[PDB]
Design a protein that fits this description.
Chain A: Keywords: Acetylation, ATP synthesis, ATP-binding, CF(1), Glycoprotein, Hydrogen ion transport, Ion transport, Magnesium, Membrane, Metal-binding, Mitochondrion, Mitochondrion inner membrane, Nucleotide-binding, Phosphoprotein, Transit peptide, Translocase, Transport. The structure is cut from a larger assembly and holds two copies of chain A and one copy of chain B. By secondary structure, chain A is of the alpha/beta class. In chain A, about 35% of the residues lie in helices and about 20% in strands. In chain B, helix 5 crosses helix 6 and helix 11 crosses helix 12. The chains are: A alpha/beta, B alpha/beta. Chains A and B meet through strand 1, helix 3, helix 5 and helix 12 of A and strand 4, helix 7, helix 8, helix 11 and helix 12 of B.
Chain lengths: ~475, ~500, ~475
């Protein structure tokens, strides 16, 4: 069936069909374009007219231009031939390596797995990152979220996780660049070639790449996450092996929806967002999951506009996660990296019956001492340290050492820290904080604990700091 | 006999820089059209019964019933080395009284940024000549680095010192080390832009600088357009194996001009009345700053966008929007400014997302750990405010931090060569300033720098050529600062 | 030809024309009014109908009422015979002294001087006001802005400047009253008659007055600043002479714009303002300028809604200025007049290469000590000054003396201070604050430095106390 463009306003294109009107979600092909331009049907406006969202720029479009109904939603290449390749929203190769040598395809719109398909298995996934492992550990096959305002360390952390978890992974990984920097896409692509996780000459590639960065119009940015996760769903269901799915940044899916919302004729909801924010997110998030058929460990970077965690976008995201790592500018500003808020990061498996009583007790002990110090800071800033009881100033000095021992040099952050990266075993993480809490290092200077790996390095640093 | 409303149309209404046009059946989205009077406009809204056209000029020149004619294409601008030394408007028209601009090349303003493949990692230093920037938040060629802060915190001055800094390279004959500059003024007053140009001419910097100016009394479409047009001029160098720097002064005013246009096109407002896609406005512009691989010439375009905050709130909507686009930011504060911290850079809140990869080995040697160290120093300074018993290690951390803070203070209009920066930082980072009174550090730096320029050009020239501090240079520096310091203390 | 009114809501009147449509900005004349009623064409709505903004009240207008096109924008008398006279928005004499028989008229809409016409000349204009001269000096031919909330001291300051600058100045002055108190215009007019800067018997007047006050509807308040500018533009260009332009109060221009925008049915911008706030301001402000052809030293009082400097009106005004004097209610309430915020007032000529290193160093030294005092306010407000270190106590004591030495009795504010007005030479201002910073008067009581002129008066005052 054939339609004609009747209106163009930014990324939103209205198309009239004299006969066979395409259903919502269908992919339409604009004729007379040099490069393929897909419109996705969003609404039926009435009068044989559909309202659509463009997957590429709308410059050059003319009222009267012919549009073909493909008879299906956007369909993309899936399967092992996506590994080591880079794809865009509509499935095209963007790596100058010729066609995606596949002939299995999948619609980017799909129903979420049902309640009966859910798995309740939850076992710890050790990261080698002290703050994460101690306080809010990740679970294999679980949903992990990395919250943060602009420039606090979401991407550095996700890259460190890819380094610490994915490089020694027994299955396949999918990375979805959603509304982020193209430079970061180039960085990651060449890094994985250098590491061999992508191989341009044999079939040993472990990672499939999907990108629609902040250079793209909102339709692209609204849909690239669906493309990225469709690739993941194939590896989960048709194989049954374990999959890692990394998304940076999932906020950009919601932001793109908000960019076109007024042009789709919607009254705004709170904070300028689309009224559909939560159901939109729900239909997308509920597909990102482990099932009885296969495991997905998902790690999603989540932007926090204006650093406000109550912003509808991040606020609605929390309920979709099993583990939350919340980054804070207030902490990053102090040179504490990773900038994890130890009093705002949580995990379903932070339970004495899962991690054991030792792990749980030390984690809660660390949180208590830090909350006690936080509550004191403001009082002592005005009335002075000398007004504190011996018990209070002991909790102050230990808390400040604990804050520092949570900081850690990342291998992927060597260009920022000037320190060699470190990976700390969970056993050593527990022991280290246990000893600080127990007052075993009360005699050591504060700075000995800053920017090190295991507790033995803090002792060595204290000796070095003497002379 | 005329019935053809395919290539032409008629003004239905005109007001506040928006013409609604009947006809123009064949007009393209974003196509430039021409009114009866000669005025141009862009077709931004294609609606079933009308075209919404934004007017590039004074709407008194448009009336109901006026014809509107198709041009055939989107906006473009003069492009090339003929623009260097010239002040132009948002469309590249000469506004400096020096004569018409005659380039052999033209370029479209609305082109999409290069994708993943044409790119290669930022690795070449873009030297500002500002100690605090080059050492703590280094900028490479192809990077985007935001300059952000309240009114009168020193934002433009960072960009100006940077442009003036390039003369050292541009006077030479090595084309891969040169940096051609573009200053885009958006929403400023003409007299300010004129004083800016006088400054760049007196420093003999205009000769390698294009000034693109859409000022406060220019129509909103011209201010909206100016950054993209300047960007196209810079992309010329980028795509021809050369290196350009572009300053957008400022993007806050561009967002305001775009907000007006959008509200008047009757596109419904979002947060703070800004259009729903105010992020996309800046993200598409800034993505076009890029470093090209050798296949595409190896050229680059570096962007320094400017954002004005209100009451120092870096965490605001539009600021964090732009922070979330760029590869770092330089954050300036009034508090620091008046304390004598000039440039007024907040270290902990400023970042570079390229880091040491954008530094010479020499700078990487002396400044490798300094940023995190200074961030930690400010935390300990705040905590130790009351004179309570402090251990030797914290006292040393405080002593060092106070002295390095003094070292990063710098005047205006004398951007420093990289080897000179390394030499001064060296004296601080190696501990030679630790026993000096904080008040006498600037005195030390002035006397020390002038001495090594006077007597040790062989050492400085070796650091500049090698791009590093060799073991021989390190031994020479060590001998110089030890004996110099012994004299200074008495 | 003739139009007919089709719609009226407050200042906004729609008019339909049968033959020939007036271009945007044209002045239309409403037929049958007792006093001239001008409508300015703002938009073409379609169907031969224009949307206009009235320059006076619209009460009594009827649908179908005839309107004529004058064939031009609002045109006003310009030239030497505007001197000594008062005119309204549309250039009518409002002083009961008959016709203003100028040889020329000018449209109130003119395009801003081009970039090529800009002057880069930066010369200090010494005011004799200590805070200004020391920290944020004014420049000859420069753009000066006086920011202030309700009742803090904008008008007193502009009146003191007219007292300190205009008499030392050799040229003409234009005062534009924009959305302020009519009785303030009456005061100014008659005081100028008394002093003789307006002469009713001779052609020796040196001031031209233009008024559209807070009794006027918004169309008049939005355009009257342009009327004032036009008068000044003539003296700048067609006489190539040094002009002083005083405007009280330029905020009222933007506020009036907000009122009309609401009636024009625009989608509103932030804080309920017109979406055109910045461009409207730019098109107006860019005309208030010195050019290569002639000098305008402009001083604009700038009202600050609810004391909020981040309000879009004052916030957008800053970048249009070369020097800013920001007043503070908190400072006024402490008794410091003029209530200038010494850490929020700036000048482009505050530059060692312009004012000399001595001036610059003392200014920055004063600001450093004041900032150091400021960021102790948290602790002082709770525990008082007695908890601070000896070092910090020294900085507090000197900063408090400097704060007081920055206050000054104005010739114009004698009823309120109770003191004779003082004007201080620049060299004396530099020297006085130099001596305080050096600790030369650490022994003197703080109150000695309050409401004096030169530093010698602070010494004499302390001697009478002890």
């Amino acid at each position: 069936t054939t339609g004609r463009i009747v209106a163009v306003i930014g990324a939103v294109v209205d198309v009239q069909f004299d006969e066979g009107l395409p259903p919502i979600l269908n992919a339409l092909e604009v004729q007379g374009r040099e490069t393929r331009l897909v419109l996705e049907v969003a609404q039926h406006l009435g009068e044989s007219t559909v309202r659509t969202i463009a997957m590429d720029g709308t410059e050059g479009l003319v009222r009267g231009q012919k549009v073909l109904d493909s008879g299906a939603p956007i369909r993309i290449p899936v399967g092992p031939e996506t590994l080591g390749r880079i794809m865009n929203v509509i499935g095209e190769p963007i790596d100058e390596r010729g066609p995606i040598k596949t002939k299995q395809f999948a619609a980017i719109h799909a129903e979420a797995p049902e309640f009966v398909e859910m798995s309740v298995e939850q076992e710890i996934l050790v990261t080698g990152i002290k703050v994460v492992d101690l306080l809010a550990p990740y679970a294999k096959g679980g949903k992990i979220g990395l919250f943060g305002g602009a420039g606090v360390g979401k991407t550095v952390l996700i890259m460190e996780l890819i380094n610490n978890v994915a490089k020694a992974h027994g299955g396949y990984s999918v990375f979805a660049g959603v509304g982020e920097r193209t430079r970061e896409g180039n960085d990651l692509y060449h890094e994985m070639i250098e590491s061999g996780v992508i191989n341009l000459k044999d079939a040993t590639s472990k990672v499939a790449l999907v990108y629609g960065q902040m250079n793209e119009p909102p339709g692209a940015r609204a849909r690239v996450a669906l493309t990225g996760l469709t690739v993941a769903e194939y590896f989960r269901d048709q194989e049954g092996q374990d999959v890692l799915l990394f998304i940076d940044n999932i906020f950009r899916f919601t932001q793109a929806g908000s960019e076109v919302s007024a042009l789709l004729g919607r009254i705004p909801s709170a904070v300028g967002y689309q009224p559909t924010l939560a159901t939109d997110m729900g239909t997308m998030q509920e597909r990102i999951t482990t099932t009885k058929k296969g495991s997905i460990t998902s790690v999603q970077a989540i932007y926090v506009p204006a650093d406000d965690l109550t912003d509808p976008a991040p606020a609605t995201t929390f309920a979709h996660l099993d583990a939350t790592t919340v980054l804070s500018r207030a902490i990053a500003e102090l040179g504490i990296y990773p900038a994890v808020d130890p009093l705002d990061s949580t995990s379903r498996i932070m339970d004495p019956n899962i991690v054991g009583s030792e792990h749980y007790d030390v984690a809660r002990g660390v949180q208590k001492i830090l909350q006690d110090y936080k509550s004191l800071q403001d009082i002592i800033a005005i009335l002075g340290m000398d007004e504190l009881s011996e018990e209070d100033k002991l909790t102050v000095s230990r808390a400040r050492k604990i804050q520092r021992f949570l900081s850690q040099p990342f291998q992927v952050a060597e260009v920022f820290t000037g320190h060699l990266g470190k990976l700390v075993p969970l056993k050593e993480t527990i022991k280290g904080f246990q000893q600080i809490l127990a007052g075993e290092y009360d005699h050591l200077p504060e700075q000995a604990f800053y920017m090190v790996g295991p507790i033995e390095e803090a002792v060595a640093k204290a000796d070095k700091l003497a002379e | 006999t005329s019935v053809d409303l395919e290539e032409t149309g008629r003004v239905l209404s005109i007001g506040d820089g928006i013409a609604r046009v009947h006809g123009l059946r064949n007009v393209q989205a974003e196509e430039m059209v021409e009114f009866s009077s000669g005025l141009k406009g862009m077709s931004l809204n294609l609606e079933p019964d009308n075209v919404g056209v934004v007017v590039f000029g004074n709407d008194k020149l448009i009336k109901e019933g006026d014809i509107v004619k198709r041009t055939g294409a989107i906006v473009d601008v003069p492009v090339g080395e003929e623009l260097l030394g010239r002040v132009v408007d948002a469309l590249g028209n000469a506004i400096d009284g020096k004569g018409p601009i005659g380039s052999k090349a033209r370029r479209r303003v609305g082109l999409k940024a290069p994708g993943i493949i044409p790119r290669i990692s930022v690795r070449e230093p873009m030297q500002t000549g500002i100690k605090a920037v080059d050492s703590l938040v280094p900028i490479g060629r192809g990077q985007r680095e935001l300059i952000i802060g309240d009114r009168q915190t020193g934002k433009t001055s960072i960009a100006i010192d940077t442009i003036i800094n390039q003369k050292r390279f541009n006077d030479g004959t090595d084309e891969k080390k040169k940096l051609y500059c573009i200053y885009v003024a958006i929403g400023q007053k003409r007299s300010t832009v004129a004083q800016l140009v006088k400054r760049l001419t007196d420093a003999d910097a205009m000769k390698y600088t294009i000034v693109v100016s859409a000022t406060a009394s220019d129509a909103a479409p011209l201010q909206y357009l100016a950054p993209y047009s300047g960007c196209s001029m810079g992309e010329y160098f980028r795509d021809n194996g050369k290196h350009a720097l572009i300053i957008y002064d400022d993007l806050s005013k561009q967002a305001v001009a775009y907000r007006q246009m959008s509200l008047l096109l009757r596109r419904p407002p979002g947060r703070e009345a800004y259009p729903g896609d105010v992020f996309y406005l800046h993200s598409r512009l800034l993505e076009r700053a890029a470093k090209m691989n050798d296949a595409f010439g190896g050229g680059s375009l570096t962007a320094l966008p400017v954002i004005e905050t209100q009451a120092g709130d870096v965490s605001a909507y539009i600021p964090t929007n732009v922070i979330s686009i760029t590869d770092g930011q330089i954050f300036l504060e009034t508090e620091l400014f008046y304390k004598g911290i000039r440039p007024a850079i907040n270290v902990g809140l400023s970042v570079s997302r390229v880091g040491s990869a954008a530094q010479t080995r020499a700078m990487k040697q002396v400044a490798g750990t300094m940023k995190l160290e200074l961030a930690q120093y400010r935390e300990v300074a705040a905590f130790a405010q009351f004179g309570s018993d402090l251990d030797a290690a914290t006292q040393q951390l405080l002593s060092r931090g106070v002295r390095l803070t003094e070292l990063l203070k710098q005047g205006q209009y004398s951007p420093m060569a990289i080897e000179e920066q390394v030499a001064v930082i060296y004296a601080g980072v190696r501990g030679y300033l630790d026993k000096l009174e904080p008040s006498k550090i600037t005195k030390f730096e002035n006397a020390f720098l002038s001495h090594v320029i006077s007597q040790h050009q062989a050492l400085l020239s070796k650091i500049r050529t090698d791009g590093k501090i060799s073991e021989e240079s390190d031994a020479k520096l060590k001998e110089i600062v030890t004996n110099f310091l012994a004299g200074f203390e008495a």
